[PDB]
């Protein structure tokens, strides 16, 4: 499918057996979600963006389904004004930019 950008490219994802909404974000290296609790061990991490940096939890090898794909990747959990699906996952689902 094709997604035009006149609106935010929001998609539904499934992680931890629950559904959430997230933004397909080509400007994001990593995936950051704020409204979920993930199980197990994690690594502290710091990411930076417009406005400054913030501390988040890095969960590795997290199973997640986006669009119609079931992939595994790193998911950062922490403060963010919007759930973001980064390139680390967009590449695995075959999402590309075209013009």
Binding region for a copy of itself (CB under 8 A) = 1-6, 8-9, 23-29, 32, 47-54, 67, 79-82, 84, 87, 90-91, 93-99
Min dist. Cβ of residue 24 to a copy of itself (A): 6
- Secondary structure, 3-state, 23-64: EECCCCCCCEECCCCCCCCCEEEEEEECCEEEEEEEEEEEEE
Kind and range of the H or E run holding 71: strand 69-77
* Site track for ligand 385 across 12-51, x = CB under 6 A: -----------x-x-xxxx-x--------------xxxx-
Active site positions, annotated:
25
Structure tokens at 71: 């992939």
Residue in this structure with the two tokens 């919007």, named with its chain if needed: 82
- Residue numbers at the binding site for ligand 385 (CB under 6 A): 23, 25, 27-30, 32, 47-50, 81-82, 84, 86
């Amino acid at each position: 499918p094709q997604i035009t950008l006149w609106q935010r490219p929001i998609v539904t994802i499934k992680i931890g057996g629950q559904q959430r909404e997230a933004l397909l974000d080509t400007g994001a290296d990593d995936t950051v979600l704020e409204d979920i609790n993930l199980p197990g061990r994690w690594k502290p991490k710091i990411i930076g963006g417009v406005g400054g940096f913030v501390k988040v939890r890095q969960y590795d090898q997290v199973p997640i389904e986006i669009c119609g794909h079931k992939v595994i990747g790193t998911v950062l959990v922490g403060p963010t004004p919007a759930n973001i699906i980064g390139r680390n996952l967009m590449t695995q689902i075959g999402c590309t930019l075209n013009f």
